[PDB]
Enzyme design. Structure first.
Site, PDB file in Angstrom:
ATOM      1  N   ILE K  88       0.852  -1.184   0.000  1.00 48.42           N
ATOM      2  CA  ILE K  88       0.000   0.000   0.000  1.00 48.42           C
ATOM      3  C   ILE K  88       0.888   1.234   0.000  1.00 48.42           C
ATOM      4  CG2 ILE K  88      -1.749   1.295   1.264  1.00 48.42           C
ATOM      5  CD1 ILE K  88      -2.758  -1.406   2.357  1.00 48.42           C
ATOM      6  N   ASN K 126       7.924  -7.825  12.200  1.00 49.81           N
ATOM      7  CA  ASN K 126       6.745  -7.037  11.850  1.00 49.81           C
ATOM      8  C   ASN K 126       5.514  -7.765  12.387  1.00 49.81           C
ATOM      9  OD1 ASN K 126       4.634  -5.591  10.739  1.00 49.81           O
ATOM     10  ND2 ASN K 126       5.628  -5.320   8.746  1.00 49.81           N
ATOM     11  N   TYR K 133      -2.460 -10.755   8.640  1.00 50.51           N
ATOM     12  CA  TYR K 133      -2.684 -11.889   7.750  1.00 50.51           C
ATOM     13  C   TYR K 133      -3.356 -13.046   8.475  1.00 50.51           C
ATOM     14  CZ  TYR K 133       0.240  -9.372   4.448  1.00 50.51           C
ATOM     15  OH  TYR K 133       0.748  -8.425   3.587  1.00 50.51           O
ATOM     16  N   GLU K 135      -5.613 -12.609  10.780  1.00 51.09           N
ATOM     17  CA  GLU K 135      -7.015 -12.210  10.808  1.00 51.09           C
ATOM     18  C   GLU K 135      -7.713 -12.512   9.488  1.00 51.09           C
ATOM     19  OE1 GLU K 135      -7.696  -8.214  12.054  1.00 51.09           O
ATOM     20  OE2 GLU K 135      -6.702  -8.451  13.996  1.00 51.09           O
TER      21      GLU K 135
END
Lengths: 169, 172, 169, 169, 169, 172, 169, 169, 172, 169, 172, 169
Positions: K88, K126, K133, K135
């Site tokens: 993103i 991270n 991911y 979730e």
């Protein structure tokens, strides 16, 4: 100095490369092939655009003024070594950008390319440049006798190096 | 040793080069291109058959036995320099051919190619080779720190050189 | 002598050429391109098969033993000039064939190619060759100073010439 | 004079080259290939962009008016020799720039390319040019007889030379 | 004579072509491109194997002995004209094969190719060949002055012709 | 007429050549290749841009108006001969430019190309052209019978020539 | 075992490669391109003969019997990692050559290529192979679920690794 | 009618060619290769731009309005025959241009190309076109049965011809 | 004659084709390209090996003797037509093989290629050939005037045809 | 049966393929391209060597006599479908090998390629083949009307299929 | 977020990709080929425009603002698997677009490409990405030790996966 | 309806094609090659410009608004069959143009291309489309089971056909 950025070289930067050479007065090479004209350079750039034996970065300031060039050549990924060169535009040579660009070059070499050794060649007749690189961490490993032919004379050059272990610590 | 003759390398000699490079235990290169197998070598030879950045010569005795290899690479015709290497086949290493090949190489480099400087690299852990090249006129100009990764560790190498003026006017 | 025949060079003659140039003491060229190995010569021959800037002929005897080579290079058809060179095999050098080969070359140059001038370079340190070419019709037109690097030192060469008018009359 | 600058030839300079060769009285060549039209010159330039057998430079003044051309051809790097030619535009011929351009050429040949000998051909019927080159350091080494067909008749030319040692000392 | 056959040229016949040329002592061409060596000829034959501007036929006898060559060149199918040449091997030149081969050539030209005019060039200094072609139906249409350069001299040649209408009737 | 200048042909002049060849009413050729349209011409020009068997020059006045074409084909450098043609644009035909272009063509052929013989073909049914070339030094060497099919019938053509020795030494 | 030699793969070995695949019953790849036929393999080998992303070695004994294959693929010279595979001919699978070939492969990977990490994939349903590699120094780093489709079923595989530091010490 | 001009087809005319086809409702060919789109036509035109088996001319009036197309195909220069076709734009089909364009086509065929026979195909179901061509000198030589497939049916066509001898007299 | 078998042409059969075409005395073509020598034929074969505009078949007896050639050219798959030719070797011409090859050709054209019309050209001065093809179902559809230049004069040729519906439904 | 082996097709098998397709009564295709001659098949094989849209396997016995061919065409890897065809040599048709070859094909399709559906076309006028495929697990899913032109008339074919789930369970 | 639309990548989007990859600070690849500059990227795009081993999609809002990149590489159609990545743009990272793009990517992979398994790699350092991911349905299948050299040291990465059967039948 | 015109697809229409295939739910193909991006479609269009295995036509109204696309694929000219597909733009789907486009497609297939059979695939879960095609002359000839993977599950499709005889009578 903290506002200086390194950017991978683009075809639009070849003009900047060309002008940097006219001041040098030494034969210029592009992936070990000689060139003098801007058209030769552009043809060679098209040819070697994917070759990974050499990498080049344009140093710009906040206002996008072209400050200099960082060069890595003879990159060997088995022995993990590469030759390094800096060329600052004549109008920016006194402002003290050199040490910042040297650290940026070493950072990319040792943190992204995962190289082990970075070496360079400095004319012995330019002892102030030799001292600069020594302050930046480089050490002399050789005194090459009559290695290059520059302005009608064979000249000696100091070959100096720095290892990844020393820069990361 | 005067029976020895230096001859430009031909495609038929590539098998000889391949057998020589198998014992090196360090990655081999052909015009700065890695190769391990014979087929890769033969294809690289075909690609660079006219490239003058490197020149190679095989030495043969009177019986045409393949003795060794003379290699000149990184040939620069503006600075007039080149890197030199010698590789004697294992079965001929102790016959004293080394000094003869070295002088043949220097003579070609300095008389027909009209080069100015010939340099070479020698493993620091190979003192007898360093002494050999010193006996032939080479002088140390650098002690390269951790230049090459060899047999599981980075090692030092001596860079040694000789100039054209010396090789051709030393006895005058 | 009368049984010495001139034949255009073929690919099968390239081995003979390679052996002649093995002991010359100067870099050999094929259409101004350097070479040392037989393989390099063969690919250069394939590349310039139709290039008319140079023409070569092998001289054989009645039993077809190869005696030498006649070479025409730097052929210009506007000015109608060409550089000539003769090379006789070591085994056939003393048999006194040179004059016949020289005139065979001149005949082809002046009767078939319709050239105007043929010139050649001969080392100053080979006076017998200079005298020979003089005796065959050539005249010195230049003493080129340090023209070629031979056996580790620059050497002078005589440039000698002969015109179509003089030979055909 | 001091403001006359040497610049490697670019594609955009080919029009200037074509105009210089329009009134010469002898067939013009590009890498030993003849040409007459601008289009033929441009495609020959594209074909030999990387061929180092010849190197050309346009000389401009401070305001970048094109004064002439310096030409190095037949460059051999084993023997380190090259043929030199200077051509000044008709509008700038009498301003006395020739000597500066000649020495600019010699400087590049002897300080950057590391050549040993530079020679040139000058028509015997142009004694002022012969005297000029003599006054700049050249010495006659040959009187080539009927070398070139110029204005409907074969003419002699002087071959003159100068060595690196003499110029750099 | 009635046992002489015409056969389209094959690659295996190029050797026969080559030998026929060594006797001539004039520059040989293949589709207007010059050649001297057998290797040049073979390369040119491969190049122009489909070009229909020239056609060649090998004349053989019953025992397949190579008798000669019939050549048509400069074939133009709008004006319907072509240049014609005969070359008989030296060992068969006196036996009287010429007139038969000439009629065979005209037959192919006028009955299969549907050509309108066949012309040729005969050296004026060979008047017996001129008479032969005149008996075979050709008529002189030109006396070309110094058209070709043969053995050191410019020579005249008779240009003679025959039309399709006259041969078919 | 001295204002006229002879210039090597460029790609930009191809439209001029095309307009000239439309009025010929005889098949046009470019290096012995037939062409009728402009696109065929431009492609043929690109193919033979370096072929030295033919050379062409356009003549311009001081105002750069396109006057005519000078054509040399069948150039042979062993026999040193070539075929010459001149084509003046219709709007400039009666201005007396012909003899000037012919001498410019002969001067280039005999001084810079160092050719030995220049020949040309003229329709027998064009006597004024035959006289023109005779006035310029050309001599008839052949009367070719039914050489070319022109406007529905085979026609004769005069082959006329001039030598280098004559053009350059006639007034000496 | 001490008489087993590793030799870089040659075109003559492709037949041996092909036979090794017919036993596997899984899709075979050559530089990530699929193949089933020997002719496909040979075409692919010619294509990628210089690509350095994969290296292969034929394991032979003293008598030159073909024992097996050592494979390195997905070689990344920045992260210095590579995937490793062993394939022993069915007739030599029980003799205990595996551990020797694994050490030879790691030796080349860590002493010549200067790689940092070597990993592999072992079918979880072959626990004896997993134990073998664990004894040789590899450790499990992943249990890939339904990673590959083998004989009509999606199968899990252990991804196991070994670092250069651990093997050299 | 006397102001109608024939002009060799250019790439800029292909659009006009394309529009003429959309009215026909029969498969169109370009050098015997099929096409429907304008892009197909342009690619084919580039491919066959030098092929001399077909020739095309655009018929224009004084004001340069596009009147029609004259087509020659299957041109054979040995038998000297060619197939001929006319296509007038729908807006000009009644004005009586046809006979003029037919004579222009025959004129080019018989006075410049030196052809011997020109033939054509006319649908028997269009008897007025058959009468037109008969008045213009053509004669029926064949009634081809179900030769072409046009709008869902196999149709007959008259094959009609005219010789060069008859048109020139 | 039932021993005869029709086989697609291979490169090895090109010599057979060349020997057949030498006796024609009319210019031979391969995909509308002229050829006279065997080398030109072999090169043209390599160029058009996949071109489906023409298909050729050689007929062999049980002993694999080369009897003749079956040729289909100008194959159009929109109109579904093609031109047919038959060439029997001289030494087999009088054995009555003609009608067998013709029907084999028609059967392949109308059953496997699903063509609609097969036409052919016959010299008007060869009446026995015209009768032969009439006996096999061909009907004259044209008398082409001075179509081909043969042995020094333009000659007429009959164009004869047969349709698929006839060949396959005539006996039903 | 158990000794029938499946092998990927090689170039050496192309003769076997040509003989199988000699008596089929329908145009043979290679990657949707038609062919008749062996030479055409061989060049098509070279062109599609790496095209994975189709996969072919020759079945041999223990003594390596070639029995037949398994063909997978129109392979789509998004939808995971493929058309199947079996051809047994006339000499081995009655020996009852078909079922084994069919299941060998299904095994490769459903266990190695991981396809989902395999379908085939069988002539309606070959009821024994329809029954056979039904007995091996195929089910009719279509009755294509006048799909193929066979022996001079359009004929219907049954499209039959089988899914991966049914075969592997 | 439903305003977001996923679109196949075009050459015009390459500048967007280049700006995204400048902030990664880890070597970028295009079909397993390294690249740093825009010109190298554009040339690599032209080389692999038809290679189906990787597929990329840019996501745009209703105003056609470039939000992020969806990347599928190592696509294998025998095993029916692929590696997935999401990137993103910095100015849109905190808007909650992540979960929407992930589900769009999984939907395309499992419905139109009919793939069986989608896996990805996440830096162990991270954790918020790992939780994200998880979730979305991804499960950890590996903890790769010192897999990548990042910012001057070798780091670990989680390999996480999701299967087609789960994504499409979990709610049934 | 009567003002709906069929036009062969051009390069400028590729954007319209890309928008139609944006919302289809199934991978789009160009000559059996998959694609997603406009750039990929454009290069595939360039590669298959002359490939006649498929033919496409855009339908426009009198004011030249693009309504939809007619697609003919898998065209075989031996069996004279082709698969048909119609796609109408979402904005023009309800205006009742489908029947006109369908018959326009059939007219071109059966009156210009001379095909024998046209078939199509329609999803079983789109009964209104099935009824439509039935009402236009198509008849079901197959119920393909799990033929395509659509929206995450395999779905059946009806294969429906129509013959040239029925349409043209």
């Amino acid at each position: 100095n903290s506002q200086l950025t390194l950017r991978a070289l683009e075809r639009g930067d070849l003009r900047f490369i060309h002008n940097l050479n006219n001041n040098r007065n030494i034969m210029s090479y592009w992936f070990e092939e000689p060139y003098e004209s801007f058209d030769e350079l552009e043809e060679l750039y098209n040819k070697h655009i994917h070759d990974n034996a050499e990498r080049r970065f344009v140093v710009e300031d906040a206002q996008k003024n072209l400050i200099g060039l960082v060069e890595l050549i003879e990159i060997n990924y088995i022995h993990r070594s590469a030759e390094f060169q800096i060329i600052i535009a004549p109008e920016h040579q006194g402002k003290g950008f050199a040490r910042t660009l040297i650290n940026r070059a070493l950072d990319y070499s040792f943190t992204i390319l995962n190289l082990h050794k970075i070496y360079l060649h400095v004319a012995v007749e330019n002892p102030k440049a030799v001292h600069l690189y020594e302050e930046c961490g480089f050490v002399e490993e050789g005194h090459l006798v009559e290695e290059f032919f520059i302005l009608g004379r064979y000249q000696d050059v100091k070959r100096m190096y720095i290892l990844q272990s020393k820069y990361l610590n």
